Amino acid sequence: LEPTDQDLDVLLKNLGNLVTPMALRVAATLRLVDHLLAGADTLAGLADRTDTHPQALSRLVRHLTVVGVLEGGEKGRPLRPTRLGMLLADGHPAQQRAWLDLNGAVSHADLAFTGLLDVVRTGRPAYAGRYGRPFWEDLSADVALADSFDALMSCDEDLAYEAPADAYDWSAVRHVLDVGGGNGGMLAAIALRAPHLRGTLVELAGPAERARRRFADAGLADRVTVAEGDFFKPLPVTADVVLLSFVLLNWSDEDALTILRGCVRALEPGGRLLVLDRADRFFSTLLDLRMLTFMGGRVRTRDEVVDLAGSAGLALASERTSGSTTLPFDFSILEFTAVS
């Protein structure tokens, strides 16, 4: 095959273009579009409001103009965002300004993509190599990253867990061990549906503190407790139900296996281990690479989790996938028993 000039152009402006996406991130981070919409319409004006180097900013601004994010400033027209540029306004529902915000977790993490070669070579995430510690430990210690990461996820919404909680019968369930339960959304929805149910959530300090508050707010502290812990170490209690809610997808096959082995060990005899997890092609592969690059994990298909569970001494007992009005993706609950 012989590449056309159009192929070359698309490679240079788009696919191989690492400059423009950083310009967008700098643009979002500086609230450039917001400052323009609030009245700034000159370079010195924007520079003054962003505390940026006037000449350097003009250069970012020329680029942003060529690529279609800003317009005007014809060297006597007024500097302004384009229709596309309006995506960076603070309140657009697509939250693109938050996604690109270098202060935010996702964009911050995206920068670790400069270590992608090593990621493809070793299968290991680049995040720690860039920032000093692994993704979740970083988010745990830094509330701005944690909250910013959470704010962009549908799981963080008010009714996020109603449907999955609705999908399983908790009536006879006595004690749920919620491994890496985050701020406790699933556990709370469960505890509310099952008044006699007790719960134990194991988490890093950051999310543990937020889960404590969620449980208190809900009148659940009497029966749902929070334990700060490392789910790579032996779990602190046993339970007739062990829950992994959107946890496995964050880990490599190897790390996910060590987590499950840990869960099987805390699972009381006869108990149930539950894994709740789960154009078009572009977005899944994007997500997949972020997951790999950020934390060493991946979205696994059903069978893949089944085989992984099988290697942890678990056998599939039942499976259910369903949709929600809240989530942009259907969810699924894999229910396992100890095969021994």
Q: Which residues are part of a known binding site for S-adenosyl-L-methionine?
A: 161, 180, 203, 230-231, 245
CB 59 within 8 A of CB 22: no
CB-wise, 115 or 207, nearer to ligand SAM? 207
Rounded Cα distance between 94 and 147, Å, is 17
Contact status: 294 vs ligand SAM (CB under 6 A): no
Q: Residues for the chain: how many in total?
A: 340
Contact status: 260 vs ligand SAM (CB under 6 A): no
Q: Which stretch binds ligand SAM (CB under 6 A): 64-72, 120-128, 198-206, 314-322?
A: 198-206
Contact status: 297 vs ligand SAM (CB under 6 A): no
Both tokens assigned to 49: 């409001």
CB-wise, 104 or 182, nearer to ligand SAM? 182
Residue 44, φ and ψ in degrees, nearest 5: -70, -30
CB-wise, 52 or 293, nearer to ligand SAM? 293
Both tokens assigned to 99: 């996604």
Provide the minimum distance between the beta carbon of 136 and ligand SAM in the complex, in angstroms, as a whole number: 4
- Residue 56's nearest CA partner among 81, 26, 33 is 26
b/e sequence 292-312, b meaning 16+ C-beta within 10 Å? bbbbbbbebeeeebbebbeeb
Rounded Cα distance between 51 and 274, Å, is 51
CB-wise, 73 or 104, nearer to ligand SAM? 104
Task: Rule CB under 6 A: choose which of 168, 215, 246, 336 binds ligand SAM.
Answer: 246
Single-letter residue type at 261? R
CB 184 within 8 A of CB 211: yes
Q: Which stretch binds ligand SAM (CB under 6 A): 102-110, 182-190, 261-269, 284-292?
A: 182-190
Contact status: 164 vs ligand SAM (CB under 6 A): no
Task: Rule CB under 6 A: choose which of 47, 204, 242, 312 binds ligand SAM.
Answer: 204
DSSP state, residue 220: -
Instruction: Give the residues lining the site for ligand SAM (CB under 6 A).
Output: 136, 140, 155, 180-182, 185-186, 202-204, 207, 229-232, 245-247, 250
